[PDB]
Structures are given as C-alpha cells and as structure tokens.
A paper describes a structure:
Phosphotriesterase (PTE), a binuclear Zn(II) metalloenzyme from Pseudomonas diminuta, has previously undergone directed evolution to change its activity from a phosphotriesterase to an esterase of 2-naphthyl hexanoate (2NH); the round 18 variant (PTE-R18) in this engineering pathway had an additional Zn(II)-binding site within the active site, indicating a loss of specificity for two divalent metals. PTE-R18 was generated from PTE by the mutations H254R, D233E, F306I, I274S, T172I, S269T, M138I, T199I, L272M, A80V, S111R, A204G, L130V, L271F, A49V, K77E, L140M and I313F. Given that PTE is naturally promiscuous for divalent metal coordination, combined with this additional loss of specificity for binding two cations, it was hypothesized that PTE-R18 could have the potential to bind unusual metals in its active site. Ln(III) ions were an interesting candidate, as their larger size compared with Zn(II) ions could result in mononuclear occupancy of the unusual ‘third’ binding site in PTE-R18.
In this work, the mononuclear binding of europium(III) and gadolinium(III) to the active site of a mutant of the model enzyme phosphotriesterase are described using X-ray crystallography at 1.78 and 1.61 Å resolution, respectively. The greater ionic radius of Eu(III) and Gd(III) compared with Zn(II) would explain the observation of only one ion being accommodated within the active site. These anomalous signals were present to over 12σ and 40σ for Eu(III) and Gd(III), respectively, supporting their placement in the structure. However, these anomalous signals were only present in chain A of the PTE-R18 dimer in both structures. Metals were modelled into this density and the occupancies were refined to 16% and 24% for Eu(III) and Gd(III), respectively. Interestingly, both Ln(III) ions are coordinated to histidine residues, which has not previously been observed in protein structures, and have a CN of six, with five coordinate bonds from the protein. To further substantiate mononuclear binding, and to provide binding-affinity data, isothermal titration calorimetry (ITC) was performed using apo PTE-R18 with EuCl3 and GdCl3. Both the Eu(III) (N ≃ 1.1) and the Gd(III) (N ≃ 1.1) titrations suggested mononuclear binding of the metal to each monomer of the apo PTE-R18 dimer. The isotherms also indicated K d values of 11 µM (95% confidence interval 7.2–17.2 µM) and 20 µM (95% confidence interval 14.2–26.8 µM) for Eu(III) and Gd(III), respectively.
Numbering used by the authors:
A (entry chain A): 35 to 259, 276 to 364
B (entry chain B): 35 to 362
Write the structure that this text describes.
C-alpha cells in the first residue's frame, strides 16, 4: 500500500529504518503558536529538531512516527518543515493523549470517531496532511472517558486500516485492559502496538500479548535515567520466537512544555544522543549479544512497514 | 490611553455602548482550527456571528469585550474577521480560564506574568493584535494555581494599565477572596470587574464590593433555564432565576448610589464546544435576541422601572470606557 506522511504518501519500500514512537515537540494545543518564546523561538526549535533528525538519519533512520496528538500540541506545519529540511519521513498521528481539553473530553464515542476520521481521511487542520497512526494514552485503571477513546480509535482503525499505538501511564502493565476493549470492538491485534512495554520486566505478560498477535513497543529505552536491562527484553522476546512482533523507539523530542520548565535540559543531559540512541547504542549492543543483522533489520525495517501499511484485512 | 481592539487602537470617544463580557466562540485552544465541522464550518460560524453582531449594532451596540482566553479557544483571527464584517469594535483578552492545559498550569507566577505581558504589549500569536483586558476564572475556593494566575494578572495590569475581569464558577460569591489577593499585589479595585455577579441576590455582598471601588459585572442577564427544567444541562449552566431578577440587581445597585460601579452584558456567544453538544441551540431557544438582549429588552425594562436614560447611558457607555482605558 502507501503510507501517509507530512510530505504526502510514500511507498512501503521508501519507509526504511523507522522509529515508531517519537515526537518533535511535547506541548499543548495552540501553545507553540501562542508562546514560541517558551522554546527560545520557533526558529530555535526548528533548528534543534532539524539537527537532531539529521543526526538520526546519518545513523540510518529514514522515517519517524510522531505520535503527538492534538492535545499534546501536535503542529503539523512544524513537522512538515523539519521533515523537508532533515530529509526524514514523518508520519503524523491523531488520537487523544493524557490532557484533553473540555472540547474533547465532553465528546461522545461517535464524535471522537468522526474527529479521528477527519484527521485520517481529510487532513489535519487546513493542511491536507493526513494522519497515519492513532495514538491513545490511558492511566492505570482505564477511566470511562479513556474507554470511549479506545473504542473510537478501534472504530477509526477499522474504517481506514491505520494502526493504533497505546500506552499505560503510571502502571507497568495495563495492556490487558486495552486488549480487552480493542477485541470487543473487532479490532485485529496486528493493528495494535502496546507501547512503553519496556517499562515492565514481567516477560511472561509481554510474551502472552505477543502470542495473541499484539505488537510490543519497546520504545522508552533511553528513559531509564538501566537501558541495557530494557534492551535485553528485545533479545528475550526474539528468543521466544516473536521477533516479528517487536517495535523499538526512543520516545524522544526536541522541546517540551507540558512538564517543568527546562525539563528538556534534563533529558538532553541523560541522553545526548537523542533519537540516535536506538541506532547508535541499542542496535550495536544487540549485535554484540549475538542477534543477527537479519533479525535486527526485520525489527527496524520490516516490522514498522507491516505495522504502518494500512491494512483493513489482517 | 487609547484602547487596543482586534482592528487596532481606538480612542475612548469611539467605544460607545459596550457589552463588557461576551465571546464569539467558547471552545478550547486549537479546536476551531482542528475540527471546524463541529460548528458546521468555520464559514458558518463566521456568518452566524456576523449576523448576530450586526443585529446588536442595529440595536446600538458599538463595542464588545470578548473575554475568551487561550484555553477557552480564543481565535483572534476569527475575532478580527467578525469585528470587521460587522463593523463592531472587539476587545480581545489574555489570561487563564478554567481549563488550562499542562503547558499553562505547570507555569510559575513569573512565567504567567510574562505570557500575559506578551499578549498585551507585543501581540497574540503572530498577529500583532494586542489584548486589552485580562480574564481570570476561579472555582469556589481559589486553588493554588488560580492564586498564581490572579497574582500574575495583577502584576501584568500594574505594568500595562490594562484592567482585569474575573468570575467564579457556579453561583459562588468569590469576589472577596479574589479582591484580597489583588490588593495584596497593590492593584487598584477600579481596575477589577467582579464578573457574573448577577448569579447571586446577596445585595450586601455586591454593595460592599462596589463601595471599595470594584466594578460589578451584572453580565449574564439573559441566562435563565426557566421552562427548561427537563434539561438538566441547561439548569446547571444558566440557572433558575428569571432575567428580570438579574436585571433588578442593576436597579438595586443604582438605588444604593453605585451606578458608577456597574457593568452590564449578556455573556453570549455564537458557538460553544466546551460543554454538551448542541448547547448552542438550547441557548438560542432561550434568548433568540442573542447579544441584542441588553439593548432591546433590559434597557427598556429598566426605563419602565423608572431609571433615567442618563443613568442607563452612564452604565452602558461611561463606565465601560473608564474601565477599559489603561490607567495604572
Ligand atoms: Cl505519547
Ligand atoms: Cl468566560
Ligand atoms: Eu510519548
């Protein structure tokens, strides 16, 4: 098929090495436009993001998935500018993160479905840029509104073929909650990535999800500020026979306003490699532990392309 | 000084009959741009707002204050488009309403002060349109974050001369708690309007604030869910007191000698997404006059009750101009 990016559709063969869970900027809807000086300037943030993406591209990355939603301050014009200047494909996201404003959290499941469909089928804002993934975040115990969001995401995925990525905040597991809801809606597990899965060491829980067909997002590796321990989960799942169900990423960004001021400086001090951490540190580490090149290319190239390719029949 | 509007600065003489507490659209940051079809379309929202403001203009309205903040979905390009097509002055707002996203509610008092000053002194987003008022909202008991917002508002007002308008969510009487914080920062009461003060009939509360020099926002006059008892969402939003009851608070404050402290408005809007779906239709059914309710129904009601025309012109023209004019 073809995959929608912020610069238009691309073919599966163009996707290449893909980081499945990233952001350019973690913010709030409208905030970058209303207070760019919070980031120094818009120009300073663009320059930082372009340098960071060029560095990742020189380490082999060809595509990132920016999973920022409306309520995380997704600015698709920023994504398009950085994508062109860095020559890295960026897939944009619809969905709902953990800070929905009243105009979102007052909505019914049917209205949320129509919102997701608008961003996937017509475009984001007035840009014509279409989302290629649906991002949902939940908390420990799924709230009633978070359940609406998951069901709307399943309905939008079933209508368009685009995949869903999800994570549970403040709890190790929680994938079982989401899996139950997604399956009640008829969604195929092969369209769902259970993200932040490197945050738990319960390997039997991850193996059980993989066996049901879910993709396992090991996508917070550099956030253990031990990263080697998290990366060994990749090896463990390969050894259980589930190399085809693994997605790897950094969950990095280049500006952040939704937490404490200057939290970006904290993150940059613990991981100065940025989104190059996966290609420069994790892949060599796994190679040294005996994972073949062919398996590594399956995880970083084959698996993301299969996931992102719109598939209504899976 | 002159007053900043979404079309640029105007002199005090051009302000005229003013509605001091209105909105074009009650929404969330970015939402009108991300899902305009929630309102039919952006074009339909503009047309509805232009038609409504032109009717208010025909009825004598010359200026409205749109108190929408960043987190209430303020879209200053929308305000400018509608102001120009209706030919009605619109004053835009900075501040913080009741639904701040994390990028706002994680900020310190010093950061919030800088944000307000940016919107007052430099402009909103990349438009160069400058805010002419600061809007703050609190809940019953001022939260820690809301206290930061009030102190930043006071600090920004003292730096720029721009006034502050408040309200408290519900029928709660929060003016005394807000006033205490504002005065601890050295802000003059004459730069503050205690909005939505018509939610209560506690005349002792209203008069004591007016006696300190606060402006009293009697600004939800048409809001009333009488007849809509089977609609629980309307009752919670609009209350159960008749519009005449709200309007007679105007007369009561005049009769105590505080005509110079009154500001009147409708608290209307032409689209709303921050509440239940289609709530716009409930509001429009209750008050088909929209923003023209004040000039068309309340003013002649108060004339019938014996208030002189010169006093009504003082409330609708003189008081808002004194209030909006930056002073410091
Ligand atoms: Cl996320
Ligand atoms: Cl308001
Ligand atoms: Eu993330």
């Amino acid at each position: 098929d073809r995959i929608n990016t912020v610069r238009g559709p691309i073919t599966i063969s163009e996707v290449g090495f893909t980081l499945t869970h990233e952001h350019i900027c973690g913010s709030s809807a409208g905030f970058l436009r209303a207070w760019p000086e919070f980031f120094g300037s818009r120009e300073a943030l663009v320059e930082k993001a372009v340098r960071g993406l060029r560095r990742a591209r020189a380490a082999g990355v060809r595509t990132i998935v920016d999973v920022s939603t409306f309520d995380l301050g997704r600015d698709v014009r920023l994504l398009a500018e950085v994508s062109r200047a860095a020559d890295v494909h960026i897939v944009a996201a619809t969905g709902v993160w953990l800070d929905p404003p009243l105009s979102i959290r007052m909505r019914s499941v049917e209205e949320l479905t129509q919102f997701f469909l608008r961003e996937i089928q017509y475009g984001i804002e007035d840009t014509g840029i279409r989302a290629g993934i649906i991002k949902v975040a939940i908390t420990g115990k799924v709230t009633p509104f978070q359940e609406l969001v998951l069901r709307a995401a399943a309905r939008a995925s079933l209508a368009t073929g685009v995949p869903v990525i999800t994570h549970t905040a403040g709890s190790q597991r929680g994938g079982e909650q989401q899996a139950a809801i997604f399956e009640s809606e008829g969604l195929s597990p092969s369209r769902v990535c259970i993200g932040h899965s490197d945050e738990t060491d319960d390997l039997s829980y991850l193996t059980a999800l993989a066996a049901r067909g879910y993709l396992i997002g090991l996508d917070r590796i550099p956030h253990s500020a031990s990263w080697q321990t998290r990366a060994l989960l990749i090896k463990a799942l390969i050894d259980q026979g589930y190399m085809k169900q693994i997605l790897v990423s950094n969950d990095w960004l280049f500006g952040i306003s939704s937490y404490v001021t200057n939290f970006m400086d904290v993150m940059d001090s613990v991981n100065p490699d940025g989104m190059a951490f996966i290609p420069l540190r994790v892949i060599p580490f796994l190679r040294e532990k005996g994972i073949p090149q062919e398996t590594l290319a399956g995880i970083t190239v084959t698996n993301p392309a299969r996931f992102l390719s719109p598939t209504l029949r899976a």
